Amino acid sequence: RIKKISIEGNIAAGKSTFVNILKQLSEDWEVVPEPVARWSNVQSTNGGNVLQMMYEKPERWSFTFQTYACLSRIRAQLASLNGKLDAEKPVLFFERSVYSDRYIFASNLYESESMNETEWTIYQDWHDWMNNQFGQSLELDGIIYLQATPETCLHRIYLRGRNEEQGIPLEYLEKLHYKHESWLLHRTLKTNFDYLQEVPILTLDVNEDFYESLVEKVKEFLSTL
Amino acid sequence: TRIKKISIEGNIAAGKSTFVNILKQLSEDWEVVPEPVARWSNVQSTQDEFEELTMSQKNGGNVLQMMYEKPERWSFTFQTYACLSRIRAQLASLNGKLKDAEKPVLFFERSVYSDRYIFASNLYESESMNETEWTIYQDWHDWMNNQFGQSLELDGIIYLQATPETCLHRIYLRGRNEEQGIPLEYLEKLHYKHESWLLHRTLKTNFDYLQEVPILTLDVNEDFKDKYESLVEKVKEFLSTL
Numbered sequence: 001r002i003k004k005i006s007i008e009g010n011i012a013a014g015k016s017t018f019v020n021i022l023k024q025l026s027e028d029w030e031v032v033p034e035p036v037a038r039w040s041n042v043q044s045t046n047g048g049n050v051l052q053m054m055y056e057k058p059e060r061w062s063f064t065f066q067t068y069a070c071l072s073r074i075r076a077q078l079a080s081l082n083g084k085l086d087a088e089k090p091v092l093f094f095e096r097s098v099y100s101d102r103y104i105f106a107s108n109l110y111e112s113e114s115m116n117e118t119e120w121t122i123y124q125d126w127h128d129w130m131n132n133q134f135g136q137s138l139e140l141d142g143i144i145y146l147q148a149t150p151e152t153c154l155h156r157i158y159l160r161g162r163n164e165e166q167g168i169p170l171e172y173l174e175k176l177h178y179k180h181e182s183w184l185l186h187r188t189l190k191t192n193f194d195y196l197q198e199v200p201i202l203t204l205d206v207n208e209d210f211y212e213s214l215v216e217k218v219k220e221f222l223s224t225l
Numbered sequence: 226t227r228i229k230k231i232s233i234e235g236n237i238a239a240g241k242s243t244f245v246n247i248l249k250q251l252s253e254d255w256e257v258v259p260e261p262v263a264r265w266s267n268v269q270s271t272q273d274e275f276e277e278l279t280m281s282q283k284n285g286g287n288v289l290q291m292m293y294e295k296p297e298r299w300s301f302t303f304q305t306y307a308c309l310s311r312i313r314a315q316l317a318s319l320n321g322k323l324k325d326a327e328k329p330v331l332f333f334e335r336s337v338y339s340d341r342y343i344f345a346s347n348l349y350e351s352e353s354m355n356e357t358e359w360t361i362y363q364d365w366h367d368w369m370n371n372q373f374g375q376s377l378e379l380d381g382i383i384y385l386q387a388t389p390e391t392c393l394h395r396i397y398l399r400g401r402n403e404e405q406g407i408p409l410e411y412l413e414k415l416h417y418k419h420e421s422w423l424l425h426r427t428l429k430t431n432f433d434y435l436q437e438v439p440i441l442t443l444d445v446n447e448d449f450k451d452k453y454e455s456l457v458e459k460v461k462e463f464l465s466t467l
């Protein structure tokens with residue numbers, strides 16, 4: 001009965017910032033952050049930084065990173081469903097989804113030859129299975145797309161200052177942007193999860209310096225779900 | 226499940242497939258879940274329902290061969306897929322087989338425990354997986370078992386014990402191309418892990434119940450006809466104790 005809403009958008013578009021603001025509007029609203037800390041310090045529960053490994057050597061580490069990213073996200077999202085919210089109208093906001101993991105990030109890595117055909121096939125097979133098992137419980141009721149230009153995202157990468165991200169080129173951001181636009185705006189990106197074609201999407205332009213009006217728009221989008 | 230789950234464990238080419246697939250014919254209540262080795266030598270994922278009507282399901286890469294060719298590069302990828310594909314196969318067979326059975330027994334060719342505590346652990350110990358890869362692997366394995374371990378918990382283990390030299394010979398007999406370069410020393414390492422886990426029982430796992438699970442050890446060094454009778458008798462007696 002918990003409504004599940006994914007917040008999507010490019011690197012440093014402002015998803016964590018936005019969701020952390022939204023969280024405060026209701027005791028009925030909780031958030032599942034992307035497990036970036038678990039990626040920056042790998043631990044089985046200081047370790048290696050697999051996000052860094054992927055950025056420094058993507059042909060070596062893209063598959064390993066992408067698999068772990070998605071595993072860690074599934075674990076976090078399932079844990080939050082099982083234990084959060086007891087709430088009048090519970091809403092869980094996910095920072096990104098298993099779908100952007102596969103159809104945006106992992107897909108772009110395969111397209112750029114950072115994963116080979118075997119790696120991509122294994123990834124998709126693992127993902128298909130993981131979702132046949134957990135798909136239902138994690139299925140989205142809606143998507144919020146925070147749309148920012150690649151140039152805005154590059155600037156915010158610098159503002160945030162995560163060391164591993166400082167070397168990301170504009171072109172890499174452009175590719176991620178076109179994928180987001182294809183999925184969420186043009187709706188030309190085909191997934192093997194049929195229900196997604198029906199999930200409503202609220203697109204919010206976040207290119208400007210921070211916002212109140214965007215927040216209000218969410219509160220009301222949720223009343224339609 | 227009322228289905229008893231029994232894992233058959235043993236080194237490469239010890240004779241687990243050969244033995245269990247003959248043994249299972251002794252009762253309509255007995256079935257086997259094979260190890261998904263074919264899925265590893267021909268990597269494939271599911272086709273779209275419309276695409277498959279006009280496009281063949283093509284041969285994929287061989288991740289088993291990739292692991293043997295360059296273990297420091299491919300061990301993590303291989304081990305992760307091996308265990309995922311195993312859990313999928315074992316869970317589907319638990320959910321779908323042996324409905325009509327009086328005393329159902331499902332035999333698993335190897336287990337998620339040997340994947341982690343024998344194979345993947347040996348790869349880590351040999352520096353074919355680094356610290357990050359090993360941490361990720363164990364993290365994922367722990368999580369998968371918190372979710373699925375209960376359905377897959379074993380009622381017993383049958384350890385097929387063969388010397389590394391016997392296994393090396395049987396690898397040649399079987400003729401799997403990607404196994405043909407395996408050195409005796411690799412087989413000996415796997416042998417010692419099996420012995421520590423299943424014979425001496427000193428190997429510590431993250432899974433409490435395993436220290437207690439009944440184990441039957443069978444010497445499979447002889448030619449098949451020479452001991453089969455004695456093995457079958459030992460198995461039936463063992464099953465009656467669970």
Ligand SMILES: Nc1ncnc2c1ncn2[C@@H]1O[C@H](COP(=O)(O)OP(=O)(O)O)[C@@H](O)[C@H]1O
Nearest residue numbers: 011012013014015016017156159160208209210
């Ligand atoms: N609308 C905005 N205007 C100015 N700065 C923003 C805005 N949104 C986010 N930021 C800043 O940009 C950086 C990235 O935002 P963050 O929420 O971490 O992005 P994401 O979660 O999408 O990766 C942070 O330093 C944040 O303070």
Ligand SMILES: Nc1ncnc2c1ncn2[C@@H]1O[C@H](COP(=O)(O)OP(=O)(O)O)[C@@H](O)[C@H]1O
Nearest residue numbers: 237238239240241242243395398399447448449
């Ligand atoms: N007891 C035995 N005596 C002679 N050959 C055996 C015996 N057990 C197995 N083999 C042969 O050894 C090879 C490996 O057997 P297999 O069952 O595929 O091993 P595993 O499943 O343990 O990897 C095969 O060629 C098989 O015919």
Ligand SMILES: Nc1ccn([C@@H]2O[C@H](CO)[C@@H](O)C2(F)F)c(=O)n1
Nearest residue numbers: 011034036066069100101105106165
């Ligand atoms: N599946 C995913 C998910 C996220 N990321 C990357 O993780 C960092 C934090 O959002 C960002 O650097 C990132 F978004 F790029 C990724 O590469 N692949």
Ligand SMILES: Nc1ccn([C@@H]2O[C@H](CO)[C@@H](O)C2(F)F)c(=O)n1
Nearest residue numbers: 237260262304307339340344345404
């Ligand atoms: N977790 C596992 C499981 C098995 N294997 C390998 O798969 C082949 C078939 O048993 C054998 O070549 C093998 F047993 F070695 C592996 O390397 N790691």
